[PDB]
Tab-separated table of C-alpha atoms and ligand atoms in Angstrom:
chain	number	residue	atom	x	y	z
A	14	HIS	CA	0.000	0.000	0.000
A	15	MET	CA	1.832	3.124	-1.323
A	16	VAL	CA	-0.731	5.201	-3.330
A	17	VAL	CA	-4.405	5.016	-2.239
A	18	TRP	CA	-7.227	3.614	-4.422
A	19	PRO	CA	-9.633	4.866	-5.665
A	20	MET	CA	-7.919	7.592	-7.606
A	21	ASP	CA	-10.078	10.112	-9.455
A	22	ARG	CA	-9.248	11.877	-12.686
A	23	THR	CA	-8.635	15.590	-12.558
A	24	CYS	CA	-8.962	16.649	-16.209
A	25	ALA	CA	-11.386	15.980	-19.050
A	26	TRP	CA	-8.604	14.582	-21.153
A	27	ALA	CA	-5.394	14.202	-19.055
A	28	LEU	CA	-4.720	10.920	-17.338
A	29	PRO	CA	-3.279	11.132	-13.801
A	30	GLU	CA	0.484	11.875	-13.959
A	31	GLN	CA	1.161	8.852	-11.752
A	32	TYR	CA	-0.059	6.323	-14.313
A	33	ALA	CA	3.011	6.899	-16.588
A	34	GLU	CA	5.473	6.158	-13.812
A	35	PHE	CA	3.409	3.075	-12.848
A	36	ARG	CA	4.256	1.776	-16.315
A	37	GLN	CA	7.967	2.590	-16.102
A	38	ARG	CA	8.225	-0.038	-13.336
A	39	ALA	CA	9.209	-3.706	-12.882
A	40	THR	CA	6.445	-4.654	-10.405
A	41	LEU	CA	2.837	-3.779	-9.946
A	42	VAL	CA	2.146	-0.767	-7.750
A	43	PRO	CA	0.642	-1.568	-4.412
A	44	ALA	CA	-2.349	0.388	-3.201
A	45	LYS	CA	-3.882	1.128	0.169
A	46	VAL	CA	-7.598	0.509	0.220
A	47	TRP	CA	-10.220	1.062	2.786
A	48	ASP	CA	-10.077	-2.568	4.116
A	49	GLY	CA	-6.262	-2.915	4.108
A	50	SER	CA	-6.385	-5.913	1.735
A	51	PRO	CA	-3.448	-6.444	-0.538
A	52	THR	CA	-4.178	-4.821	-3.858
A	53	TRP	CA	-2.168	-4.116	-7.000
A	54	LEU	CA	-2.748	-1.488	-9.691
A	55	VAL	CA	-2.119	-2.736	-13.185
A	56	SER	CA	-0.918	-0.183	-15.732
A	57	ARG	CA	0.796	-1.836	-18.734
A	58	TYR	CA	-1.010	-2.952	-21.905
A	59	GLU	CA	0.822	-6.339	-21.844
A	60	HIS	CA	-0.374	-6.856	-18.246
A	61	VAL	CA	-3.965	-5.660	-18.421
A	62	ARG	CA	-4.562	-8.002	-21.293
A	63	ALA	CA	-2.783	-10.998	-19.708
A	64	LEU	CA	-4.774	-10.810	-16.453
A	65	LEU	CA	-8.161	-10.052	-17.939
A	66	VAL	CA	-8.005	-13.296	-19.948
A	67	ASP	CA	-6.369	-15.354	-17.224
A	68	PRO	CA	-8.579	-18.109	-15.699
A	69	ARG	CA	-7.281	-17.450	-12.163
A	70	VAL	CA	-8.649	-13.865	-12.006
A	71	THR	CA	-12.227	-13.615	-10.637
A	72	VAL	CA	-15.077	-11.038	-10.725
A	73	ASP	CA	-16.836	-12.674	-7.714
A	74	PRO	CA	-17.751	-9.634	-5.661
A	75	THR	CA	-17.013	-11.333	-2.340
A	76	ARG	CA	-13.341	-11.603	-3.308
A	77	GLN	CA	-12.866	-7.942	-4.261
A	78	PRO	CA	-11.197	-5.810	-1.610
A	79	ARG	CA	-13.638	-3.358	-0.100
A	80	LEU	CA	-13.003	0.239	-1.234
A	81	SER	CA	-15.120	2.136	1.324
A	82	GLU	CA	-17.735	1.677	4.001
A	83	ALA	CA	-20.561	1.950	1.444
A	84	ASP	CA	-18.876	-0.671	-0.821
A	85	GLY	CA	-20.479	-4.104	-0.651
A	86	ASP	CA	-21.780	-7.084	-2.628
A	87	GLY	CA	-25.302	-5.675	-3.143
A	88	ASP	CA	-27.212	-8.302	-1.173
A	89	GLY	CA	-26.672	-11.095	-3.635
A	90	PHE	CA	-27.311	-9.019	-6.712
A	91	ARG	CA	-25.316	-10.495	-9.597
A	92	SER	CA	-25.345	-9.749	-13.356
A	93	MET	CA	-23.251	-11.762	-15.777
A	94	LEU	CA	-20.598	-9.079	-15.337
A	95	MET	CA	-20.221	-10.355	-11.779
A	96	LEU	CA	-19.907	-14.033	-12.616
A	97	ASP	CA	-17.033	-16.228	-13.770
A	98	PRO	CA	-17.219	-18.931	-16.420
A	99	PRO	CA	-19.064	-21.245	-16.749
A	100	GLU	CA	-22.057	-19.467	-15.165
A	101	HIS	CA	-20.976	-16.307	-16.970
A	102	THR	CA	-20.931	-18.197	-20.260
A	103	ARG	CA	-24.452	-19.580	-19.990
A	104	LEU	CA	-25.850	-16.102	-19.321
A	105	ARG	CA	-23.872	-14.239	-21.954
A	106	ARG	CA	-24.747	-16.925	-24.579
A	107	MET	CA	-28.419	-15.973	-24.260
A	108	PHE	CA	-27.834	-12.312	-25.085
A	109	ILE	CA	-24.925	-12.508	-27.561
A	110	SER	CA	-26.586	-12.829	-30.994
A	111	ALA	CA	-28.526	-9.654	-30.480
A	112	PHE	CA	-25.159	-7.905	-30.445
A	113	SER	CA	-23.218	-9.431	-33.292
A	114	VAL	CA	-21.700	-7.158	-35.956
A	115	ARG	CA	-24.270	-8.020	-38.633
A	116	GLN	CA	-27.126	-8.020	-36.275
A	117	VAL	CA	-26.182	-4.571	-34.915
A	118	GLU	CA	-25.703	-3.283	-38.423
A	119	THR	CA	-29.464	-3.763	-38.984
A	120	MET	CA	-30.218	-1.022	-36.467
A	121	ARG	CA	-28.336	1.641	-38.357
A	122	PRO	CA	-31.626	2.910	-39.954
A	123	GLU	CA	-33.391	3.262	-36.651
A	124	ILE	CA	-30.303	4.927	-35.132
A	125	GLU	CA	-30.057	7.386	-38.020
A	126	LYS	CA	-33.750	8.326	-37.670
A	127	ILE	CA	-33.317	8.702	-33.943
A	128	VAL	CA	-30.308	10.976	-34.125
A	129	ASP	CA	-31.971	12.971	-36.963
A	130	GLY	CA	-34.861	13.888	-34.626
A	131	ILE	CA	-32.621	14.740	-31.661
A	132	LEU	CA	-30.611	17.035	-33.901
A	133	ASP	CA	-33.810	18.689	-35.290
A	134	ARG	CA	-34.942	19.188	-31.676
A	135	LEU	CA	-31.535	20.441	-30.574
A	136	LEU	CA	-31.070	22.888	-33.494
A	137	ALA	CA	-34.455	24.438	-32.681
A	138	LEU	CA	-33.037	25.641	-29.312
A	139	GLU	CA	-31.404	29.012	-28.635
A	140	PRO	CA	-27.695	28.249	-27.963
A	141	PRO	CA	-25.559	27.668	-25.949
A	142	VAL	CA	-26.819	24.127	-25.377
A	143	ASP	CA	-25.555	21.246	-23.227
A	144	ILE	CA	-24.477	18.206	-25.356
A	145	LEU	CA	-25.029	15.591	-22.647
A	146	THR	CA	-28.652	16.594	-21.953
A	147	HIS	CA	-29.633	17.370	-25.566
A	148	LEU	CA	-27.676	15.042	-27.791
A	149	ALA	CA	-25.655	12.330	-25.989
A	150	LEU	CA	-28.140	11.063	-23.336
A	151	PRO	CA	-31.240	11.253	-25.551
A	152	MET	CA	-29.700	9.098	-28.256
A	153	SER	CA	-28.049	6.481	-26.095
A	154	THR	CA	-31.287	6.220	-24.118
A	155	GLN	CA	-33.673	6.008	-27.096
A	156	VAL	CA	-31.389	3.545	-28.770
A	157	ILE	CA	-31.233	1.290	-25.708
A	158	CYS	CA	-35.017	1.596	-25.070
A	159	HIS	CA	-35.706	0.602	-28.686
A	160	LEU	CA	-33.393	-2.426	-28.569
A	161	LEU	CA	-34.664	-3.588	-25.145
A	162	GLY	CA	-38.300	-2.406	-25.201
A	163	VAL	CA	-37.985	-0.267	-22.043
A	164	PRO	CA	-40.327	2.721	-21.934
A	165	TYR	CA	-38.551	6.030	-22.791
A	166	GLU	CA	-41.265	7.808	-20.769
A	167	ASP	CA	-39.548	6.275	-17.754
A	168	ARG	CA	-36.136	7.711	-18.611
A	169	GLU	CA	-35.960	10.280	-15.864
A	170	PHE	CA	-36.305	7.585	-13.209
A	171	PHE	CA	-33.787	5.022	-14.519
A	172	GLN	CA	-31.209	7.610	-15.739
A	173	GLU	CA	-30.883	9.216	-12.367
A	174	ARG	CA	-30.949	5.809	-10.698
A	175	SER	CA	-28.266	4.371	-12.993
A	176	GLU	CA	-26.001	7.320	-12.326
A	177	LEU	CA	-26.260	6.739	-8.598
A	178	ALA	CA	-26.121	2.953	-8.737
A	179	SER	CA	-22.819	3.191	-10.632
A	180	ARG	CA	-21.138	5.052	-7.680
A	181	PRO	CA	-20.030	2.157	-5.523
A	182	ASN	CA	-18.540	4.275	-2.717
A	183	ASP	CA	-21.567	6.464	-2.253
A	184	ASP	CA	-24.460	5.791	0.209
A	185	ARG	CA	-27.173	6.327	-2.341
A	186	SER	CA	-25.962	3.595	-4.699
A	187	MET	CA	-27.843	0.851	-2.805
A	188	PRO	CA	-31.363	2.302	-2.687
A	189	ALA	CA	-31.011	3.292	-6.355
A	190	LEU	CA	-29.759	-0.152	-7.212
A	191	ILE	CA	-32.770	-1.673	-5.292
A	192	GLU	CA	-35.169	0.614	-7.151
A	193	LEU	CA	-33.738	-0.229	-10.547
A	194	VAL	CA	-34.071	-3.983	-9.922
A	195	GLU	CA	-37.625	-3.311	-8.791
A	196	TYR	CA	-38.352	-1.330	-11.950
A	197	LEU	CA	-37.118	-4.146	-14.192
A	198	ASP	CA	-38.786	-6.714	-11.954
A	199	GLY	CA	-42.189	-5.132	-12.862
A	200	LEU	CA	-41.190	-4.765	-16.571
A	201	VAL	CA	-40.119	-8.384	-16.948
A	202	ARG	CA	-43.345	-9.617	-15.187
A	203	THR	CA	-45.293	-7.558	-17.731
A	204	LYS	CA	-43.281	-8.904	-20.690
A	205	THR	CA	-43.650	-12.450	-19.380
A	206	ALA	CA	-47.466	-12.192	-19.562
A	207	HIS	CA	-47.310	-10.232	-22.861
A	208	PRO	CA	-44.053	-10.893	-24.711
A	209	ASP	CA	-42.982	-8.146	-27.096
A	210	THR	CA	-40.156	-8.380	-29.618
A	211	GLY	CA	-37.133	-6.405	-28.626
A	212	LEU	CA	-34.385	-7.999	-26.659
A	213	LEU	CA	-36.079	-8.466	-23.266
A	214	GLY	CA	-39.372	-9.815	-24.598
A	215	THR	CA	-37.508	-12.101	-27.027
A	216	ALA	CA	-35.571	-13.531	-24.073
A	217	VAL	CA	-38.841	-14.146	-22.208
A	218	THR	CA	-40.067	-16.071	-25.192
A	219	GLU	CA	-36.950	-18.045	-26.076
A	220	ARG	CA	-35.183	-18.487	-22.683
A	221	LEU	CA	-37.416	-17.724	-19.763
A	222	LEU	CA	-40.556	-19.582	-21.068
A	223	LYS	CA	-38.255	-22.351	-22.238
A	224	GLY	CA	-36.466	-23.034	-18.970
A	225	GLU	CA	-33.031	-21.492	-19.781
A	226	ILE	CA	-33.104	-18.533	-17.474
A	227	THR	CA	-34.773	-17.560	-14.244
A	228	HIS	CA	-36.788	-14.493	-13.504
A	229	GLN	CA	-34.161	-12.854	-11.196
A	230	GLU	CA	-31.359	-13.534	-13.751
A	231	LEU	CA	-33.279	-11.814	-16.574
A	232	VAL	CA	-34.165	-8.921	-14.315
A	233	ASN	CA	-30.557	-8.511	-13.128
A	234	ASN	CA	-29.015	-8.609	-16.587
A	235	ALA	CA	-31.735	-6.216	-17.775
A	236	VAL	CA	-30.534	-3.726	-15.167
A	237	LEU	CA	-27.059	-4.248	-16.536
A	238	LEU	CA	-28.138	-3.888	-20.201
A	239	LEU	CA	-30.159	-0.789	-19.384
A	240	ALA	CA	-27.560	1.092	-17.353
A	241	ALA	CA	-24.487	-0.019	-19.323
A	242	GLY	CA	-26.429	0.680	-22.528
A	243	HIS	CA	-27.022	4.374	-21.891
A	244	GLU	CA	-24.745	5.819	-19.259
A	245	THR	CA	-21.556	4.652	-21.011
A	246	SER	CA	-22.237	5.843	-24.558
A	247	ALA	CA	-23.736	9.081	-23.241
A	248	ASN	CA	-20.362	9.998	-21.687
A	249	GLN	CA	-18.216	8.718	-24.490
A	250	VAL	CA	-20.186	10.822	-26.989
A	251	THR	CA	-20.085	13.925	-24.814
A	252	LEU	CA	-16.313	13.668	-24.184
A	253	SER	CA	-15.737	12.942	-27.877
A	254	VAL	CA	-17.490	16.144	-29.047
A	255	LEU	CA	-15.109	18.009	-26.757
A	256	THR	CA	-12.094	16.264	-28.228
A	257	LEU	CA	-13.151	16.886	-31.819
A	258	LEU	CA	-13.912	20.468	-30.942
A	259	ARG	CA	-10.441	20.632	-29.345
A	260	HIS	CA	-8.812	19.504	-32.645
A	261	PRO	CA	-10.631	21.378	-35.375
A	262	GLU	CA	-8.913	19.683	-38.330
A	263	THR	CA	-10.487	16.415	-37.142
A	264	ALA	CA	-14.107	17.549	-37.215
A	265	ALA	CA	-13.740	18.851	-40.773
A	266	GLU	CA	-11.733	15.927	-42.118
A	267	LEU	CA	-14.354	13.490	-40.919
A	268	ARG	CA	-17.216	15.649	-42.147
A	269	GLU	CA	-15.298	15.554	-45.524
A	270	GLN	CA	-14.288	11.847	-45.376
A	271	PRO	CA	-16.816	9.672	-43.431
A	272	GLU	CA	-14.909	6.443	-44.224
A	273	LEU	CA	-12.433	7.748	-41.653
A	274	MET	CA	-15.056	7.772	-38.887
A	275	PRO	CA	-14.828	4.150	-37.642
A	276	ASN	CA	-11.114	4.434	-36.879
A	277	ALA	CA	-11.704	7.883	-35.452
A	278	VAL	CA	-14.294	6.366	-33.094
A	279	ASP	CA	-11.779	3.712	-31.988
A	280	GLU	CA	-9.266	6.463	-31.404
A	281	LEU	CA	-11.832	8.375	-29.257
A	282	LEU	CA	-12.495	5.225	-27.297
A	283	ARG	CA	-8.752	4.613	-26.652
A	284	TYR	CA	-7.976	8.280	-25.806
A	285	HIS	CA	-10.694	8.767	-23.209
A	286	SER	CA	-10.932	5.159	-21.926
A	287	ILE	CA	-13.938	6.129	-19.855
A	288	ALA	CA	-14.538	2.709	-18.323
A	289	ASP	CA	-11.637	2.346	-15.858
A	290	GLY	CA	-10.361	0.805	-12.649
A	291	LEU	CA	-11.882	-2.630	-13.173
A	292	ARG	CA	-11.952	-4.846	-10.127
A	293	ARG	CA	-10.507	-8.349	-10.106
A	294	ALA	CA	-8.906	-10.699	-7.630
A	295	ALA	CA	-6.486	-13.552	-8.089
A	296	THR	CA	-7.867	-17.003	-7.064
A	297	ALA	CA	-4.400	-18.591	-7.292
A	298	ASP	CA	-0.809	-17.454	-7.608
A	299	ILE	CA	-0.028	-15.738	-10.896
A	300	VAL	CA	3.425	-14.997	-12.224
A	301	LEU	CA	3.696	-11.758	-14.170
A	302	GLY	CA	7.330	-11.222	-15.207
A	303	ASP	CA	9.233	-10.237	-12.017
A	304	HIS	CA	6.115	-10.065	-9.876
A	305	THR	CA	4.216	-12.903	-8.234
A	306	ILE	CA	0.594	-12.053	-7.572
A	307	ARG	CA	-0.687	-14.137	-4.612
A	308	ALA	CA	-3.908	-16.109	-4.177
A	309	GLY	CA	-6.406	-13.572	-2.923
A	310	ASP	CA	-4.709	-10.401	-4.056
A	311	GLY	CA	-7.030	-7.686	-5.404
A	312	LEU	CA	-6.309	-6.177	-8.787
A	313	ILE	CA	-7.324	-2.783	-10.142
A	314	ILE	CA	-7.193	-2.844	-13.836
A	315	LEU	CA	-6.419	0.504	-15.424
A	316	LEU	CA	-7.728	0.276	-19.007
A	317	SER	CA	-6.916	3.891	-19.532
A	318	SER	CA	-3.234	3.558	-18.654
A	319	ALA	CA	-3.013	0.548	-20.938
A	320	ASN	CA	-4.661	2.453	-23.754
A	321	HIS	CA	-2.006	5.122	-23.196
A	322	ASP	CA	0.868	2.653	-23.007
A	323	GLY	CA	3.796	4.156	-25.016
A	324	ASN	CA	5.172	0.650	-25.780
A	325	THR	CA	1.983	-0.134	-27.689
A	326	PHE	CA	0.730	3.284	-28.838
A	327	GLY	CA	3.195	5.886	-30.167
A	328	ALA	CA	2.660	9.405	-28.647
A	329	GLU	CA	0.052	8.013	-26.307
A	330	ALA	CA	-1.178	11.388	-25.032
A	331	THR	CA	-1.816	12.551	-28.631
A	332	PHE	CA	-5.206	12.314	-30.267
A	333	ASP	CA	-4.523	10.847	-33.633
A	334	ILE	CA	-7.344	9.657	-35.895
A	335	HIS	CA	-4.945	8.030	-38.373
A	336	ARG	CA	-3.221	5.571	-36.070
A	337	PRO	CA	-4.759	2.205	-36.424
A	338	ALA	CA	-6.394	1.970	-33.010
A	339	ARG	CA	-8.607	-1.137	-33.225
A	340	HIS	CA	-6.545	-3.047	-30.637
A	341	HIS	CA	-7.273	-0.707	-27.692
A	342	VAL	CA	-8.974	-2.102	-24.585
A	343	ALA	CA	-11.567	0.584	-23.857
A	344	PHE	CA	-14.168	-2.289	-23.913
A	345	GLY	CA	-12.037	-4.429	-21.577
A	346	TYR	CA	-10.733	-7.783	-22.840
A	347	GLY	CA	-11.296	-11.476	-22.043
A	348	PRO	CA	-14.639	-13.147	-21.185
A	349	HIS	CA	-16.372	-9.948	-20.032
A	350	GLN	CA	-15.237	-7.922	-23.056
A	351	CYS	CA	-18.077	-5.364	-23.759
A	352	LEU	CA	-21.095	-7.228	-25.135
A	353	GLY	CA	-22.285	-3.847	-26.466
A	354	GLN	CA	-19.165	-2.725	-28.339
A	355	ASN	CA	-20.530	-2.834	-31.938
A	356	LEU	CA	-23.646	-1.040	-30.806
A	357	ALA	CA	-21.461	1.511	-28.972
A	358	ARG	CA	-19.363	2.141	-32.080
A	359	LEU	CA	-22.266	2.388	-34.473
A	360	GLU	CA	-23.978	4.852	-32.141
A	361	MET	CA	-20.895	6.998	-32.008
A	362	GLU	CA	-20.199	6.855	-35.735
A	363	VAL	CA	-23.771	8.042	-36.516
A	364	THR	CA	-24.088	10.615	-33.729
A	365	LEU	CA	-20.676	12.324	-34.272
A	366	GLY	CA	-21.059	11.951	-38.069
A	367	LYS	CA	-24.481	13.594	-38.277
A	368	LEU	CA	-23.712	16.277	-35.642
A	369	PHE	CA	-20.699	17.681	-37.435
A	370	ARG	CA	-22.277	17.196	-40.868
A	371	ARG	CA	-25.130	19.419	-39.578
A	372	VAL	CA	-23.657	21.932	-37.194
A	373	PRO	CA	-20.504	22.364	-39.187
A	374	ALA	CA	-19.475	25.459	-37.203
A	375	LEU	CA	-20.349	23.978	-33.836
A	376	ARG	CA	-18.121	25.729	-31.259
A	377	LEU	CA	-17.202	25.312	-27.572
A	378	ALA	CA	-19.396	27.618	-25.543
A	379	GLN	CA	-17.151	27.514	-22.457
A	380	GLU	CA	-13.445	27.356	-21.705
A	381	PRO	CA	-12.510	23.695	-21.407
A	382	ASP	CA	-10.580	24.140	-18.180
A	383	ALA	CA	-13.799	24.979	-16.343
A	384	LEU	CA	-15.399	21.623	-17.170
A	385	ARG	CA	-16.642	19.701	-14.146
A	386	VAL	CA	-15.343	16.090	-14.246
A	387	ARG	CA	-17.198	13.047	-12.833
A	388	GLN	CA	-15.358	11.425	-9.942
A	389	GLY	CA	-16.156	8.350	-7.872
A	390	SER	CA	-17.394	6.060	-10.604
A	391	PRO	CA	-15.811	3.469	-12.857
A	392	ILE	CA	-17.425	5.358	-15.809
A	393	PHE	CA	-15.674	8.661	-16.376
A	394	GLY	CA	-17.304	11.744	-17.963
A	395	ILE	CA	-18.109	15.415	-17.542
A	396	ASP	CA	-21.288	16.867	-15.924
A	397	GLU	CA	-22.029	19.304	-18.826
A	398	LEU	CA	-20.710	20.365	-22.249
A	399	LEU	CA	-22.070	23.692	-23.525
A	400	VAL	CA	-21.898	24.470	-27.247
A	401	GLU	CA	-22.879	27.355	-29.647
A	402	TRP	CA	-23.235	27.655	-33.467
B	519	LIG	C1	-18.539	3.613	-25.150
B	519	LIG	C2	-19.385	2.745	-24.660
B	519	LIG	C3	-18.962	1.638	-23.806
B	519	LIG	C4	-17.769	1.371	-23.200
B	519	LIG	C5	-16.535	2.278	-23.204
B	519	LIG	C6	-17.942	0.091	-22.568
B	519	LIG	C7	-16.967	-0.589	-21.823
B	519	LIG	C8	-17.171	-1.832	-21.241
B	519	LIG	C9	-16.228	-2.466	-20.422
B	519	LIG	C10	-14.864	-1.888	-20.135
B	519	LIG	C11	-16.747	-3.646	-19.982
B	519	LIG	C12	-16.034	-4.693	-19.125
B	519	LIG	C13	-16.034	-4.425	-17.611
B	519	LIG	C14	-15.252	-5.499	-16.862
B	519	LIG	O1	-14.648	-6.459	-17.473
B	519	LIG	O2	-15.232	-5.432	-15.602
B	519	LIG	C15	-18.049	-3.729	-20.530
B	519	LIG	C16	-18.925	-4.731	-20.290
B	519	LIG	C17	-20.232	-4.705	-20.767
B	519	LIG	N1	-20.812	-3.792	-21.624
B	519	LIG	FE1	-20.027	-2.171	-22.206
B	519	LIG	N2	-19.173	-0.369	-22.840
B	519	LIG	C18	-19.851	0.499	-23.546
B	519	LIG	C19	-21.132	0.436	-24.068
B	519	LIG	C20	-22.048	-0.540	-23.901
B	519	LIG	C21	-23.310	-0.580	-24.525
B	519	LIG	C22	-23.989	0.385	-25.493
B	519	LIG	C23	-23.893	-1.741	-24.114
B	519	LIG	C24	-25.296	-2.001	-24.510
B	519	LIG	C25	-26.073	-2.685	-23.713
B	519	LIG	C26	-22.978	-2.405	-23.212
B	519	LIG	C27	-23.130	-3.602	-22.555
B	519	LIG	C28	-22.103	-4.194	-21.798
B	519	LIG	C29	-22.306	-5.517	-21.145
B	519	LIG	C30	-23.549	-6.378	-21.108
B	519	LIG	C31	-21.158	-5.833	-20.499
B	519	LIG	C32	-20.939	-7.100	-19.699
B	519	LIG	C33	-20.272	-8.138	-20.588
B	519	LIG	C34	-19.933	-9.374	-19.807
B	519	LIG	O3	-19.809	-9.316	-18.551
B	519	LIG	O4	-19.781	-10.468	-20.372
B	519	LIG	N3	-21.836	-1.646	-23.166
B	519	LIG	N4	-18.297	-2.627	-21.290
B	520	LIG	C1	-16.913	-0.332	-16.020
B	520	LIG	C2	-18.211	-0.054	-16.720
B	520	LIG	C3	-19.300	-0.921	-16.109
B	520	LIG	O1	-19.339	-0.296	-14.831
B	520	LIG	C4	-19.826	-1.210	-13.984
B	520	LIG	O2	-19.616	-2.395	-14.174
B	520	LIG	C5	-20.562	-0.518	-12.889
B	520	LIG	C6	-20.865	-1.136	-11.747
B	520	LIG	C7	-21.841	-0.575	-10.778
B	520	LIG	C8	-20.883	-0.029	-9.750
B	520	LIG	C9	-22.463	-1.664	-9.996
B	520	LIG	O3	-23.141	-0.961	-8.923
B	520	LIG	C10	-22.542	-1.273	-7.648
B	520	LIG	O4	-22.987	-2.613	-7.443
B	520	LIG	C11	-22.657	-3.186	-6.181
B	520	LIG	C12	-22.818	-4.659	-6.305
B	520	LIG	C13	-23.204	-2.538	-4.943
B	520	LIG	C14	-22.692	-1.134	-5.104
B	520	LIG	N1	-23.193	-0.244	-4.041
B	520	LIG	C15	-24.589	-0.511	-3.711
B	520	LIG	C16	-22.429	-0.448	-2.807
B	520	LIG	C17	-23.186	-0.633	-6.454
B	520	LIG	O5	-22.815	0.721	-6.513
B	520	LIG	C18	-23.549	-2.099	-10.904
B	520	LIG	C19	-24.179	-3.295	-10.204
B	520	LIG	C20	-24.706	-1.120	-11.072
B	520	LIG	C21	-25.744	-1.694	-11.983
B	520	LIG	C22	-26.622	-0.461	-12.206
B	520	LIG	C23	-25.292	-1.986	-13.377
B	520	LIG	O6	-25.492	-3.106	-13.826
B	520	LIG	C24	-24.224	-1.146	-13.946
B	520	LIG	C25	-23.589	-1.772	-14.951
B	520	LIG	C26	-22.642	-1.002	-15.706
B	520	LIG	C27	-21.713	-1.468	-16.534
B	520	LIG	C28	-20.559	-0.582	-16.864
B	520	LIG	C29	-20.265	-1.370	-18.127
């Protein structure tokens, strides 16, 4: 225990200075955590990847070192994201085909129509406008509600609850988590009696009414699909508008060459690495070069630091939309690698694409060293991003 964890980011785009020294090392950095349990931080691309696919690393919440007084296992609440193979595998198998490349590519039309209407609505407003509230959150939310069949009318309730649920060191995360489960509990009971199409109702029909999945399991993974599905993209899109605004050439080059967008999106994902500080524990000894991780040791997986690893990515702190960037780990790696990632990328490609095609002189409406940054959550972002045109 040298540096304390959790560490919060301080800048909308800078990673913490410490991370780069962490990578210059021969060991893993030890960290002091609320419960005094042995815990390493993991900073190198080589390492992050090795451990995330290793079979002796667990997500079991009871093995993770406790990071605060409010941090806990959630009273037996488990999504697939909190299970190891083979139980993990059974649950992810039921949801996977909805998310394949070619399957996700069939939603492009509905995503385009969706973002079209948000932009019409947004451009009707007197600027300056906030991107998170008027572009990023509306699209991620509508898109996830369409895929899942969750009512958009409910979005104020589940948005605010997801935000709070995803703060594991905050008092309010438990009641919000309880309420979200309760909301999906009612929704799944409804869909059970009246299956719709859309991912939840299709799983009622094919898995739940066929004996492949229980009621609590569907409910729990529905919380996960709902919250992951909007809160993440919302922040990635917001931060990305900032970054493109911060590098004007990039906005205009994309606007003038859309075939450059997919790699640009991957570069935005790498650069910001908004999902960070993943929690794992060793279940057996694990040899990583010089260092021997011991049965029971906690691990804090820094996707961001690995995405900014100099030994893998040249000029790591630079935003560069021409570096092949497909091999970043913004969506993790290994069994739990983001089930949504093709949907995330499509959403971004269409949202950023249409926004700068339409508001081609979009400008920052505030100075980007007065941005509030989100702290205390494994999903980074900024509270607000004001723009003019
Ligand atoms: C930019 C957007 C997103 C980023 C950066 C992101 C990142 C990640 C990361 C890092 C993980 C792994 C966490 C871990 O191993 O502990 C993950 C898992 C997950 N993501 Fe995402 N994600 C995004 C969007 C989405 C979207 C749109 C969906 C749609 C529902 C989604 C669904 C999931 C699911 C279900 C998992 C759990 C997979 C499993 O445990 O097998 N994600 N994501
Ligand atoms: C790293 C990004 C993932 O962040 C995540 O995986 C986000 C995980 C959030 C933290 C977890 O919330 C914490 O859960 C604990 C078990 C209890 C804890 N509180 C009550 C002490 C609660 O905050 C999850 C369970 C919140 C659910 C709303 C939810 O499924 C969130 C899933 C989000 C997925 C993101 C992909």
